[PDB]
Point group: D3
Chain length 244, copies 6
């Protein structure tokens, strides 16, 4: 219903805990959530009291993907302009998170489906509950894994695993999502918040600028030859010398 | 001896079971097999009663690579024109399978060596017998892993694993080929046909056009930046809207 | 102190055993070691009695990265010319090893930190002691993982693993470095020299030219599309036909 | 003064004629202009009566670059948050223009410096007056040609010409701009509008969907191998068959 | 009528002069011509008395594009199988030409439209008459410039020029084609054959193996970084040392 | 005879005028010249009184390519070790020049053949006399255009022009070299030095750090997508803000 109620956050000891807040809608990404998520991310990004951002979810789902009703059906009733406006709101906040000034952590306690793979990839690190389920179910409602989700599967998991995942639309457990490197680690649900909290506290003790440059370098040198990446990392360090 | 006897198939319930059929020659890819495989693949590809193609082998080998006598020795006796004609027949059917209209499955019960890595990679999914052996033995007869096999090892397995595999010419078991993601899964031989049959039946229940676009997207977005892959998947879905 | 004492070697039965020789300095890469390593590598490379090169270390470390005093502090006191001259000495011997005429093996018994990742990557194969520790500690002294180390982590390990490794500056054990494919294998320290010796003896029994072309092809086809890699491997084999 | 006055537009014969509207400030790109350009472009893009958009300038400038006061000095005063907010507003409208639903034409009658190169490249076609002047004067102000302006130079002009243009900070005339393919055509100032009207009028008589898929194809296949581009153009036509 | 009559050739002074042979149909590419061109090219390629191949056209056309009746309408009538069979026949002969063993020359005396761009690009060199006309008229028929023709435009001509050529569907004269480097040279129709004879005659006096490795190098190093291209050209010369 | 005499230089108004100094041997690149060029370049690069380096030639040649006696015949006599040692010495100084700290200008008054293309490309700008001659005569000697010379042709000139240049081994005049953008400008021999002095003199009046970051940007963004290039140029300016 209300746009500013679709995302909630709390800053505690330099950690921004951000939650998808449509628990009864399995935190489906609707245009209202997409717009409000950008608003919250943009406001938190450069605060000197935010060193780490954790993306969680309320209720049994982390994120059940895009809102079938509000993101797909309602926007397409407004024609191409409607579809484009809605796509842009989704892609824009996933990119804001992907290139965030502060280190980002996905805390995935529950269902992570489809369009949730953009935000999952956009988090630098990811920690899952054993009980979590990850799935590209798009094939199972007759569409391509969109919102970059095909590329997310290919950039994080081995090619055979990614192909099975996208084609068969079966779910991975938390432990399988760790084995195939969709996430960093899986543990029982009741240890997950303590582990994420520990990782956040470790990052805030490092030099914040050094952490920003390092996470960026990791994502960027993926799309370079070894030779070009060598020179790139020298130019980055000259940038960090200015910021530090 | 006879060109049309080097490959056999059977279509049962929308699954094309295709077998390398030179069991006494460990299903060596000879020019006769290469030509006949293209003929069989081309005829099956667009039949409305074929939803999935399974590539198996007769006898103890899946495929022991290229025929040393008929593919290498005899063709090179015909000079460059002979070598080129033979190369083209091999590369052409591997590409036909790589970009097949229908989902493809490798059922690897036995030996998979050398030139078999092109067809193995060209199958979207791969299931192995624990007893199967995978090897790049080229180094062990003084040649580079050709027919794209070096690239197959690098595109599916981690770089260190690929380097050991190509340089040392040692065999991986089925279970090791699963661990290193050369295949999706390994199981005892006597469960392998039941598992492959189950996977085929699951794919034929999906929208066939959606499965084609998804498998293609997986292979294609490997060779794109994240940013270019995002737009690509939007253009693909517009294509699928036309086909569906 | 003395430049020619910072690296030692011994050739036994066609294996060059090369050691970082600053044990009391945890084999820190100083400009003296960088210069002497290039001298030793260049002299060994084309000897007909050297078929394999093993890179080890004296004392408890394999390589604790760059010498904080002699590589960073002292060179930067000589301004940009000093920094550039020192960088060039490091990058040049890592590249000499990366593209070496003979197969290369890292025997990592102990600490491998930071700037050691260039040489580790430049070795074709890598074998670790269970007791070995691998770490990008740069973040923990406020710099980017330089000397290509970010790219090394991204080229060998899965993206999530690489991101955690670079951002958190925690150590991987030998067994974890094997699991994540930073190295080929981990075993107890007291088996490591016997295993490396076995692998070296296996490579020297192969055709030396075939091993050189294969290791190069593995590294090169990483940075090509599948289609361009297919043609590339044909051109390489024409090159090997000339050398053999 | 007023954000809403920094851009104006008129629709004539289903052509949107859009103008930088800060003539006394040489249509420098201020945050106000950047936010208003985005608004205007977003509002016109999916209008069924707008077939083509022309970007022009009031006064003796087309666009003299970024506003050195409002984009650089005033935003840096607000530290990194202010700089990033201002960069995002600039990059976002250049990108909206670069991927516009409708064909785009730059009508360059006068000065085109520095940050104007983004918008210049983001236009599909570009027609200059002979008395127009194009330059990357960045080097003379002691900064790199930013806002992608160095890449615009390298993507449009021969590498020697881009190198001279960027390093010497000297202006190209409309005639030289046309010679080095920064623009399509140069003509006397008094023929410029009529040629642009003619071109816009020819485009509007084509299938609008076809012109959109074509201009996107041209831009995209530049960052693709020939082989990948052949498949891509088939995927695109499948898309267009849905959209027509 | 007859498939065998759609292409003719004559060998003169070890030059194969090959001609599109449907002059009354403006040498449009029908499936029949596509299958016969492949046959002819395959048969001439490894003849020890053919040093060079020239592609020409009978009648006022070089090639007016794909046969709108036989390639598009008649094949779509046979649904997707028919379309794919017809596309494969076109793409396959363009590719055979693009990677030909012998140097290739387009002799463009008249019309060169649309699908003719494949064969145009597949020729290593291209000489036009001044009265020749080149265009991508696709946009005026409401389709994308397919058959790789959009990539041919972007690969040969400056991006502004490719953009105008593709979007406006207007023709370039032989003189403008030469100016924008779609062809090497333009000359009056009555000098065309003599210049082509001269060029073919100069090529045949070179080491044929050297000319083949050189034209392939030029085409390949375009899709390589400078650094990767330096190593590649050394690998190529090792190949040529085997082949000479 | 003497290694130290193969290169000379004079500093005038903070411009290093460096000359190939084997005029009787058409400044062919011998190992001696290769080792001495590196020495000279390394020694001048970080001098606070050298703002610009110009590369010229004594005698009627700029550089006629590699010394066929000292670089090819004498080194091959020492087998593979000798060939690799000689290649490394050539490639190493071209690279030092290509990434020089100071802006670089080729002053091409006469012959520029084959292996001279490395140094030609490694210069940021290039000014030719009208009576200069440029060619890849490699094909006429039966070798591929090596030393990256084929890539230099493809990177600087339109693909048709590179193809003709490489395949026909015919010379371009200074005027045609300027037309196809192998050099910036061509002028009568007696105006050449004065234009070069003027250009070097304009560069020295700029912020030297800005000119270095700019010329490197131009070279680097050519091997980047537009999207990756936009981010890269921001990272570079952060670097320059440290260095200024
Ligand atoms: C996530 C899921 C497994 C949770 O199951 P559950 O806990 O049993 O929840 P239910 O589906 O019974 O109901 C949850 C509510 O959220 C809604 N919902 C769940 N996923 C949704 C989605 N992706 N979009 C919109 N609404 C969604 C349901 O319609 C229901 O709303 P309602 O009760 O007011 O009608 C299940 O809802 C699901 O499969 N979601 C779809 C996932 C998907 O296909 N994603 C693709 C988008 S890219
Ligand atoms: C696959 C293999 C392990 C099976 O071993 P096996 O079951 O004991 O079979 P054998 O080798 O004893 O004999 C099988 C028959 O197939 C032939 N054969 C096996 N692999 C072959 C190959 N790659 N090419 C041609 N013939 C082959 C053998 O010559 C023999 O023919 P014959 O009995 O009529 O002379 C073994 O044949 C082998 O190593 N093959 C070579 C694999 C290879 O090097 N591939 C590289 C090609 S890219
Ligand atoms: C490798 C290491 C764990 C070994 O610990 P240890 O066995 O307890 O050794 P210590 O640090 O107590 O002392 C070893 C000696 O080597 C020196 N040393 C260790 N690593 C060094 C490095 N990277 N550069 C320079 N000197 C180094 C120490 O200063 C000490 O010298 P000293 O006793 O003469 O003063 C530890 O030395 C270390 O953390 N090294 C730094 C690793 C690093 O940060 N690398 C980044 C460079 S890219
Ligand atoms: C166009 C130019 C070459 C000379 O033209 P001119 O007709 O003499 O114009 P002027 O320099 O007198 O114009 C100055 C006025 O325009 C404004 N102006 C021009 N370019 C501006 C810019 N880039 N940023 C902010 N204001 C600018 C000034 O604020 C000033 O206002 P004023 O009239 O109150 O003094 C000169 O204005 C110029 O070099 N501008 C900057 C170009 C540049 O470096 N662009 C790249 C930036 S990314
Ligand atoms: C060349 C051209 C500009 C005018 O030349 P012209 O001398 O007036 O030629 P015509 O148009 O009278 O030629 C028509 C005849 O050629 C045939 N023809 C020409 N181009 C053809 C094509 N692309 N497909 C099929 N047939 C074609 C027609 O079947 C017709 O046969 P007909 O004589 O029995 O009527 C015109 O033929 C043309 O535009 N052709 C199509 C160009 C094109 O769009 N190519 C891209 C396709 S990928
Ligand atoms: C410049 C050229 C076209 C004719 O110019 P010219 O004024 O007639 O010069 P000459 O051929 O008489 O010069 C010959 C002398 O220069 C030397 N020379 C010229 N080019 C040389 C080269 N590439 N390698 C070694 N020596 C060379 C010869 O050793 C010879 O010495 P000599 O005077 O004792 O006989 C001719 O020298 C030439 O083609 N050179 C080689 C060009 C080439 O192929 N370069 C590519 C190599 S990568
Ligand atoms: C078809 O469009 C989309 C699909 C998805 C997830 O599969 C996410 C966002 C989209 O806009
Ligand atoms: C050397 O040529 C080939 C090698 C291989 C397998 O290693 C496969 C096909 C070939 O044409
Ligand atoms: C900041 O420069 C460097 C960093 C490193 C390792 O992190 C290695 C070599 C370098 O020159
Ligand atoms: C240094 O920042 C910028 C520079 C430019 C043009 O030089 C354009 C936008 C920017 O944000
Ligand atoms: C839309 O299909 C095609 C188009 C073209 C040229 O526009 C060439 C071959 C094709 O198959
Ligand atoms: C074949 O080796 C070379 C060739 C060239 C130029 O053709 C330059 C340097 C080389 O090492």
């Amino acid at each position: 219903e209300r746009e500013e109620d679709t995302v909630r956050y709390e800053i505690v000891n330099n950690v921004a805990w951000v939650y998808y807040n449509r628990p009864t809608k399995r935190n489906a990404q609707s245009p209202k959530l997409n717009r409000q998520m950008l608003k919250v991310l943009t406001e938190l990004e450069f605060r000197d009291d935010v060193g780490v951002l954790v993306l969680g979810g309320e209720g049994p789902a982390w994120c059940a993907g895009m809102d079938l009703k509000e993101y797909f059906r309602e926007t397409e009733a407004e024609g191409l302009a409607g579809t484009r406006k809605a796509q842009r709101e989704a892609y824009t906040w996933w990119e804001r998170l992907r290139w965030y000034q502060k280190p980002t952590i996905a805390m995935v306690h529950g269902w992570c489906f489809g369009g949730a793979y953009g935000p999952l990839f956009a988090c630098d690190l990811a920690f899952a509950a054993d009980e979590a389920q990850f799935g590209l179910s798009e094939v199972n409602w007759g569409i391509l894994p969109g919102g970059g989700a095909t590329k997310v599967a290919v950039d994080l998991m081995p090619m055979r695993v990614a192909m099975y995942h996208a084609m068969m639309g079966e779910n991975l457990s938390g432990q399988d999502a760790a084995r195939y490197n969709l996430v960093n680690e899986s543990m029982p649900a009741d240890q997950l918040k303590a582990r994420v909290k520990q990782v956040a506290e470790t990052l805030i003790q490092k030099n914040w600028a050094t952490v920003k440059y390092t996470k960026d370098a990791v994502r960027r040198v993926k799309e370079m030859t070894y030779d070009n990446a060598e020179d790139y990392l020298i130019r980055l360090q000259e940038g960090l010398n200015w910021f530090d």
